[model samples]
Target chain A: SHMVVELAYTDPDRAVDWLVRVFGFRLLLRQPAIGTIRHADLDTGGGIVMVRRTGEPYTVSCAGGHTCKQVIVWVSDVDEHFMRSTAAGADIVQPLQDKPWGLRQYLVRDLEGHLWEFTRGAVAMT
Target chain B: GSHMVVELAYTDPDRAVDWLVRVFGFRLLLRQPAIGTIRHADLDTGGGIVMVRRTGEPYTVSCAGGHTCKQVIVWVSDVDEHFMRSTAAGADIVQPLQDKPWGLRQYLVRDLEGHLWEFTRHL
Candidate 1:
């Protein structure tokens, strides 16, 4: 069994550009349907994430509203990653904080306010 | 550089875990504050990890009226058997099991709290 997280977008092409320029993800596959990005898969060297242009009846809602979902990703250098994202105009939800859990981490929001957390070292929770 | 962990919100952690295991064949890994309020728990999907937390007020991937927005696609060994088991256990089928032009035999289900899952096997 394997997993892929599919993010919904209004304009998937714009989303794809941001993911590449801001988040450092590489586009692995981009499939268009009717001249629109039907689906795109990105490789981050850890797992694959799919991007789908929404409005289909069966697709999940990624509409602009309240969002409670959060994604965690690991990076080699916390400081460098944090700075890079900030420089790329990522919305910093939480500045870098060294947690007692042993992780130096920070939280940022993507174009649609999806939460993405980057960390170095494993978090220890009691 | 990129391993993904999906975190979803749920009201009843125990019941959610039970349904996931019974209906989808997921294995449990960790449940924090296990006795009282199950604030966090992890399940192994064989391909990735799913983390469930107590449902909160804010909107999530499921959107304004739904429980979550995240869709997880899993590759299973047997689509027919998996479909039968899920149907027998009363999973809400969003899409009936069928063959797709993309060379996959797949089906979709809405899990407890509206998380979308697509189960597919390469054909």
Candidate 2:
């Protein structure tokens, strides 16, 4: 089973490196063509997230200082991940806190300002 | 392995859930407010879970006119049938079902909120 997210970046190579350094994502495949990353997949320990060079017909909304998309990544230790992400130059959108929904989550923005919420202990539905 | 739960922006959660179910064969797992005025919902998209919530709020966001900076690739059993199903449900076809050089048959669709969705299956 896979739930993949495709992200656009002007410099996918640098973005991929940052994701690896900060989020502990493993580079699964780095397919480069014509001096640009045509497709690169990273294993976030959950599923594959793909990144490609920008120039697609799509544009993200950042109105009211909000991103068009947000992702919740399941991690083992939310606190440790939060600290590591902050140290790696991630912008903290929300500080580490436990939610009433039984999840310990911290929100942050990636290099492109897409919101990412690192969550733990949230019950998954069967 | 953990699962990546992607939360997509939509105008109306209830209407979006209906379109997702009727066209994409997604199963509704949970929805807020039994009266169908849903603020958030969980959908079982066969492979994994996708959450949909209201858009344009301080908490959630969406594209203004064209498309978002994100797209999701989904693996379906049959690409042709899936394409036809979505078409019958009045989904906006971005690209007709076609085979790619990458050794997969895929098709692209723009959902209710301009989120590009590519459905594919190995040939």
Candidate 3:
């Protein structure tokens, strides 16, 4: 597929740096403008998660405290990924557990308030 | 959609189900209903799967207003057709469909629940 997800963020420093260190993601490309990052491509290996620092669409409003977005990143080895994330001091929200829906997964807060789930599963989500 | 997919929440997954189907042109793959809450439902974009469910914690758009802390960008075959369907069906289109220099004909929308979605196709 061409693209799956991109997070619009206000802070690129913490969002980008912490993604690399904690979740084992790398920067595919970085678009920098002046002191702030204009855009960034987070290579999740499985897919690219784009992050942009623009407030263009903030014009609309919602019950902000009423809903949240958590990103799911699939990995080949759930345990190994969990190990590194925990060691890197990831803010683990849900401990690694087997799901009845057929998955081995763990959830963590990126320490930046953004959340992520790392799971190893069928991969046949087709 | 394959390796990466966004899981979202809705007050009424049932209402969301029909809305997504009618407006976004996605097909429902799985629907595990519960008297209370199952927090899981799957839909297909033909290219991949996208779904709705409940989060363990209270869910929010995660950003002020209708803005999102993150975004879900989906690649479809006919973005303009999808955009037309979306707008005609009261899709709350925030951005008009247009071709971007980044090589995509895309539009931005906030679903009935204020969830962020980017519908795009190759320009």
Candidate 4:
């Protein structure tokens, strides 16, 4: 499967730093002025994450306004992963909870405002 | 038509199945292990495919690795009409329809939670 995320940030450097130090990711490349969204491959190497700096699209308004975003990742062990995230200064937003659907998951706020949910499969979702 | 492969982290594939069904109008086509511990469930939304995974084993994206993103880009037809439908369906509008240099009209919305969704229409 292929996955790509386009995220915006106030400071891309700090976000890159947190991903590198904690998640075992390293900087691959940086776009010139659009904002350097680094790529990190947690398992088989790194991946590409393009970060934009300007809020050109933010000018448009509807009934409501723009807000934060959360990305979910599946892990083998939720407990062990939570510890690793804690050591890296990730602000745990929600402790691990098993959903009625059978997923043991928790939310953490990264250095930036982006939310990352690490979850472990509690049962086969058949 | 362009093709996009979505590598989403999945824990409960069943719940994801339900969510995709209600939200994207997708239905399950097949559920099988693609490779290693990665059990893949294939779904069809309208006409396209949405493959999900449930693995006690860890996995990553095929093309771009280690790239955690906050939002995904989805192209639609009418921005204002979509706003009406989405808002009525309880989607939180992030940005209303606006013109882009890329030559498309787009808007952003968040689902029941805060998942960022950008719906753009070709002009």
lDDT to native, each model: 0.73, 0.72, 0.68, 0.57
Top-TM-score candidate index: 2
Poorest 10 consecutive residues by lDDT, candidate 4 chain B? B61-70
On a 0 to 100 scale, what is the lDDT of residue A8 in model 2?
71
Candidate maximizing DockQ: 4
lDDT of 4 by residue, B12-121 (tens): 66566666566545576666553334366767654356666653333442222342434756666656776676666665677876788878888887644344768778
Can you list the residue pairs that collide in candidate 2?
Answer: none
Cα deviation of A112, candidate 3, in Å: 21
Tens-place lDDT digits, model 1, residues A25-124: 8998887534667777787444566677665543334432222346666666779778778999899999999989557989888898777777662222
Chain A TM-score per model, please list them: 0.77, 0.77, 0.75, 0.59
In model 1, pairs of residues that clash are A46-B2, A66-B59, A67-B59, A67-B60, A68-B59, A68-B60, B61-B68, B61-B69, B62-B68, B62-B69
Question: TM-score for each prediction?
Answer: 0.46, 0.46, 0.44, 0.42
DockQ of 2: 0.06
CAPRI quality band, candidate 1: incorrect
Put down candidate 3 lDDT per residue, A1-126, tens digits, no spaces.
222366756687678887888778887656653455765666685555666554543322222322336888888788988998989887899999999999999988875577888888224344
Off by over 4 Å in 4: A1-3, A32-48, A54-68, A121-126, B1-30, B33-123
Interface DockQ of each model: 0.05, 0.06, 0.07, 0.08
lDDT string for model 1 (B1-123, tens) is 444577777788778888998998888787776466556777877777778777642212222133445687788988999999999999999999998887889999998778788999954
